[PDB]
Copies of this chain bind each other. A is one copy, B any other.
Amino acid sequence: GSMDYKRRIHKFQAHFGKKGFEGALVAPGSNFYYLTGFNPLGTLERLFVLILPSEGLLTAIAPRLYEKELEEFNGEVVLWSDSENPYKIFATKIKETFKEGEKLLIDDTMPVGVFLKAKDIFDKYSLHPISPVISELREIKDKDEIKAHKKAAEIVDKVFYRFIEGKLEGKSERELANRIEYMIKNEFGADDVSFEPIVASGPNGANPHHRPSHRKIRKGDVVIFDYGAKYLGYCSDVTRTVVVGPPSEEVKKVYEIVKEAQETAVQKVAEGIPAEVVDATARGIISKYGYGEYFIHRTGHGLGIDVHEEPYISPGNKKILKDGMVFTIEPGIYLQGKFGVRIEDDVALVDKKGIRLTNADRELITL
């Protein structure tokens, strides 16, 4: 990836050098990768930290066996071995640190412990979550991050067509889900899935929180797939709904409703118009046709390094949509004991307009 980081850091530094904070501690994860491009794979019990100061060159703490995949670094570097004790490697640092009793930011994501076990020696400051600050620089993507997103939407587009060519009758929701994960990953530059694929078939479609089960796919089933890829660590997220064998008129009716709702809501995305009104566009269409009480979630959510992040396209939200924002548009109708239908696309706001990054056929296909 062509992105910088040094600027991201220095306007993160200068977003509390613009809100008054004296610290921010981060560990392997989204905020980490976003701030460095590095993602150390396989940590836990094994302390790994980057402290971010007033403003200036941050820090890097080990452990040893990671260096020969740490050929370059700025703020660097210090190494501890499978013999030395961390927490007491906050020794000087620890202090450094900063004045006893001033402000600090920590990863919400990260477990305490790697903190509790510091104690002595780390109950001498005013700590407060990191998300409210770093969030507002992640919620605006740069040109390159958009390229990561569109590229991620591309892989998943390719996955859709390859997949519906396959045979679905007789395989279980869990098989299909695993095969979809294998499809994604056997493509580049998929690093990985953005989340474990979801396959919801038959009346399991009416359950938004469905997790693939053992139920085999059979003629007459409407089957929802929901899955995603990572490209240079940026996430896609797509949902399509198919029918196995001729659909009923009620399925045909409900599908079109969800199609139009989604399409009109996509068209409505624009720099300057609130999140909730994009929810309302979608929600209003479903309602006009009677299914208002069967649309039982928000219309979409932000994508980024995580599959769920800002902006959140919800009925109670007047955040004003802005250039660089990336999110999902995904209304659905859910009919308990019958079936569900959701159609979900990834959208990025460029040059005042909402552009779809995912482009796979949004018409009801019969398999």
Contacts and interface: CB of A to CB of B under 8 A. Distances in A.
A66 B209 contact: yes
A187 to B, nearest CB: 10
A68 B107 contact: no
A77 interface: no
Given A45-B309, A209-B41, A296 B65 contact: yes
Nearest to A316: B83
A217 to B, nearest CB: 15
Secondary structure of the A contact surface, majority rule: loop
A117 B297 CA distance: 24
Contacts of A315: 82-83
A65 B297 contact: yes
Interface string A170-184: 000011001001100
How many chain A residues sit at the interface, stated as a range, is: 35 or more
Interface in A188-212: 188, 192, 195-196, 207-211
Interface of A: 29, 41-42, 44-46, 64-66, 68-69, 82-83, 106-117, 119, 122-123, 127-131, 174-175, 178, 181-182, 185-186, 188, 192, 195-196, 207-211, 214, 296-298, 306, 308-309, 314-316, 336
8 contacts: A65-B209, A68-B336, A69-B210, A83-B316, A109-B113, A175-B186, A181-B181, A181-B185
